[PDB]
């Protein structure tokens, strides 16, 4: 009884984790966004110097 | 954090479009200035 109560609590925790992770997976990645932000920042600095 | 990076990337896209608009218009202005200079040279004793 005690182990199955703990098991259902851990199952609820896993379902909360999956519920947040599915919403996060509707958004694009993190590191690729950092790479394209670095590229856009370099291009914006070059365009600002040209302007 | 992904929300912040997505919104800041959209802001950087808008800023890059503005830099391109400034540059295009700026280039046109420069071209006009060159024509004006040419006209002045033609007008140009000495």
Curated annotation (Swiss-Prot), chain A:
Protein name stated in the entry: THO complex subunit 7
Localization (cell): Cytoplasm; Nucleus; Nucleus speckle
Task performed by this protein: Component of the THO subcomplex of the TREX complex which is thought to couple mRNA transcription, processing and nuclear export, and which specifically associates with spliced mRNA and not with unspliced pre-mRNA. Required for efficient export of polyadenylated RNA. Plays a key structural role in the oligomerization of the THO-DDX39B complex.
Highest taxon of the lineage: Eukaryota
Subunit structure: Tetramer; as part of a THO-DDX39B complex. Component of the THO subcomplex, which is composed of THOC1, THOC2, THOC3, THOC5, THOC6 and THOC7. Component of the transcription/export (TREX) complex at least composed of ALYREF/THOC4, DDX39B, SARNP/CIP29, CHTOP and the THO subcomplex; in the complex interacts with THOC1, THOC2 and THOC5; forms a coiled-coil dimer with THOC5; together with THOC5 and THOC6, plays a key structural role in the oligomerization of the THO-DDX39B complex. TREX seems to have a dynamic structure involving ATP-dependent remodeling. Interacts with NIF3L1.
Interval of the full protein contained in this chain: 103 to 153 of 204
Entry's family note: Belongs to the THOC7 family.
From Swiss-Prot, chain B:
Source taxon at top rank: Eukaryota
PTM remark: Phosphorylated on tyrosine upon binding to activated CSF1R; which causes a dissociation of the two proteins. Phosphorylation at Tyr-29 modulates mRNA binding.
Effect caused by changing residue 29 to F: Impairs mRNA binding, enhances CXCL12-dependent cell migration
Cell compartment(s), UniProt: Nucleus; Cytoplasm
Phosphotyrosine: modified positions: 29
Tissue spec. comment: Ubiquitously expressed.
Described purpose of this protein according to its UniProt entry: Component of the THO subcomplex of the TREX complex which is thought to couple mRNA transcription, processing and nuclear export, and which specifically associates with spliced mRNA and not with unspliced pre-mRNA. Plays a key structural role in the oligomerization of the THO-DDX39B complex.
Subunit structure: Component of the THO subcomplex, which is composed of THOC1, THOC2, THOC3, THOC5, THOC6 and THOC7. The THO subcomplex interacts with DDX39B to form the THO-DDX39B complex which multimerizes into a 28-subunit tetrameric assembly. Component of the transcription/export (TREX) complex at least composed of ALYREF/THOC4, DDX39B, SARNP/CIP29, CHTOP and the THO subcomplex; in the complex interacts with THOC1, THOC2, THOC5, THOC6 and THOC7; forms a coiled-coil dimer with THOC7; together with THOC6 and THOC7, plays a key structural role in oligomerization of the THO-DDX39B complex.
Family, similarity comment: Belongs to the THOC5 family.
Name by which UniProt lists this protein: THO complex subunit 5
Name of the coding gene: THOC5
């Amino acid at each position: 009884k005690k182990q199955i109560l703990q098991a259902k609590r851990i199952r609820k925790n896993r379902q909360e984790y999956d519920a947040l992770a599915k919403v996060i997976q509707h958004h694009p990645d993190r590191h690729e966004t950092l790479k394209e932000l670095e590229a856009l920042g370099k291009e914006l600095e070059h365009l600002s110097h040209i302007k | 954090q992904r929300k912040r990076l997505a919104e800041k990337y959209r802001e950087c896209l808008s800023n890059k479009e503005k830099i391109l608009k400034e540059i295009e218009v700026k280039k046109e202005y420069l071209s006009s200035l060159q024509p004006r200079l040419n006209s002045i040279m033609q007008a140009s004793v000495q």
